[PDB]
Design a protein around this ligand. Sequence first.
Ligand SMILES: Nc1ncnc2c1ncn2[C@@H]1O[C@H](COP(=O)(O)O)[C@@H](OP(=O)(O)O)[C@H]1O
Ligand SMILES: Nc1ncnc2c1ncn2[C@@H]1O[C@H](COP(=O)(O)O)[C@@H](OP(=O)(O)O)[C@H]1O
Ligand SMILES: [Mg+2]
Ligand SMILES: [Mg+2]
Ligand SMILES: [Mg+2]
Ligand SMILES: [Mg+2]
Lengths: 6, 6, 333, 333
Amino acid sequence: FDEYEE
Amino acid sequence: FDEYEE
Amino acid sequence: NFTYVSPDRYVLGPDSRRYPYNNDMPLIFIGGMPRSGTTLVRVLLDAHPDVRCGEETRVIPRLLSLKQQWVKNPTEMHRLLEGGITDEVLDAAMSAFILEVIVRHGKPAPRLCNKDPFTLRAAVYLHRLFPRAKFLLMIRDGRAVVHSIITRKVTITGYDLSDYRQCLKRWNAAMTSMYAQCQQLGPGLCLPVYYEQLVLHPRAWMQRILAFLEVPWNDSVLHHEQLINQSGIALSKLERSTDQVIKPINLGALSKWVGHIPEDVVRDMAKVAPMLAQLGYDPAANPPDYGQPDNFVLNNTLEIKKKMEEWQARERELEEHRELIKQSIAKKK
Amino acid sequence: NFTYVSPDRYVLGPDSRRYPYNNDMPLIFIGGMPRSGTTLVRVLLDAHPDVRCGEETRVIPRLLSLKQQWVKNPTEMHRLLEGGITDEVLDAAMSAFILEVIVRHGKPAPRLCNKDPFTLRAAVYLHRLFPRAKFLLMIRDGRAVVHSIITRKVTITGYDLSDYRQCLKRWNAAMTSMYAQCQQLGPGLCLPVYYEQLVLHPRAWMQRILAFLEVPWNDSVLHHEQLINQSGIALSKLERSTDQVIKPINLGALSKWVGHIPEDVVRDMAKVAPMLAQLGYDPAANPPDYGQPDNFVLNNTLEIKKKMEEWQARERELEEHRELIKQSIAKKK
Ligand SMILES: Nc1ncnc2c1ncn2[C@@H]1O[C@H](COP(=O)(O)O)[C@@H](OP(=O)(O)O)[C@H]1O
Ligand SMILES: Nc1ncnc2c1ncn2[C@@H]1O[C@H](COP(=O)(O)O)[C@@H](OP(=O)(O)O)[C@H]1O
Ligand SMILES: [Mg+2]
Ligand SMILES: [Mg+2]
Ligand SMILES: [Mg+2]
Ligand SMILES: [Mg+2]
């Protein structure tokens, strides 16, 4: 998982 | 999407 | 120390009959491999006046899978913990989502049920969410399950529809997992229901199931085809089992698979699918002797053969109600 | 018809002070692009005695994204409707999940808040779930946002950290969507909060925010660094903004980006990022004149500079705590 996902 | 996902 | 009370939200309908609901309610979860009799057994329960199950929700197993992806990834699990998203928090959110779906997607009833096959991979987690829920795990000969998957082209992520051996190995792994979850919970919480035995002996098996669930016997469960005909059981025209469950319980699908498994897989069957013998299915037998059919189910089977033109009509009307939808989907294009 | 009464679940903090909760409560959702001042503004609201926001939940934006995948796909949309999973059912489930996370992942307060940046892409849908919620959309010069993303190597799905032009096009598309959601809701429901203005004029902008939310003024919002110091505001040591929000509001990040944008992108700025001029940022200015700083924030900025060693100690102790955890992750593997 990235720091954020759109 | 498939009919089922495990 | 923070306490979080959740008073009974409730359903009301005609005559304002109240149906309260919360995580402690005695829910019924049904599952197993797809193509193992799960729709049949949920429809037999729907035929009881006290129980409502309804159609597959799809979103419940998909949310369970997404939750597993979160908690199993170590980086993500640590980010959640440092955001305050403890198991207590995540469990409260998950249970609230799942409960709302179960309650609202169908008519109210004294006992609510859900059937989505692969929920039983998460039965131990669901017992944590819903401590008074009970579980039915359908069991069917893996050779019959895989024959159904391949012949009917049922799409399941990771199942190669051109490969019996690969599908049986997937079946074997899935059932090792689901059977283990069921036995972790133990017999007060999870009842394995054998498809072939339910079909051969419906009155005795439905007695066993209803006693396990603490629901009183009702002969209505032996007339489910009539209750479908007067819209007392909800069915999705897009689910692949709808055209089979509209018939009375019958013998036609016990051993259709025989002679359709490639020779090399038949020779290797005990090694390909060790779960067969573990569950009581002889891997050397083509087919096992599943038992002697009750006269009730022999008679149903004969009557279906007599009314074959009436049943062919309804099968067609279902395929045409399917094409109307597959037109409305290419219209969304 | 069938009606679903959901009475008030509630929270008990110490001294048995009751905190009921349901979908009609006046929630506050904060969002915008990551690296636009979203943690700052939620920490300033946490500093108010009546409001609690807390850390990013991560699961709320992820659930919203998964839900979009379902209802966006025509085949799955049809399967859901045929399973009884109407918008009304799915909204009840989604709202319950989201509300449980917001309520339980932090301490109780008269007004509850959530900040997860990309939830504002779903603001119109969240207004359908939570009709009395209000929304704060952070706005920041896209050049500052992308400079932050790239220099701090913030991972965001689909952002190429080697490419300023690509990241500014992504910023532009995200803000066009989020700003449109905000204006669809309108000024009674969504307030754009401009980062550089909030930093330059914190008393006037916090007054404006608190008026919009219908929360009385409190000077405590101008001392948030002190409340962090005594654990009165919850922070995740794994979020990337923690080492900046521990400081008083200050001027250091307004225009750090200037001179770090490749010349071809500076030339093409107005075409690459047309949302800059739309939102009031001159794409030809490097930097825009964001305005004149209040003496309060000039004084804060001077005092931070005087304590440069005290702050660098805290920023290193933070990376140290980040190090312990990346150990506890290579050990979890
Ligand atoms: N009335 C009925 N009597 C016996 N078996 C039935 C039945 N209705 C459904 N089934 C069987 O249930 C299986 C589908 O299981 P599921 O609902 O878990 O997908 C099908 O197997 P086949 O595909 O081998 O015919 C079907 O024949
Ligand atoms: N006390 C403070 N004063 C001014 N800006 C602050 C601040 N605390 C955080 N910010 C700014 O908020 C930005 C991060 O926003 P978000 O919380 O939306 O990720 C950071 O920008 P930079 O990375 O340009 O320094 C940071 O400097
Ligand atoms: Mg009998
Ligand atoms: Mg008999
Ligand atoms: Mg006031
Ligand atoms: Mg001034």
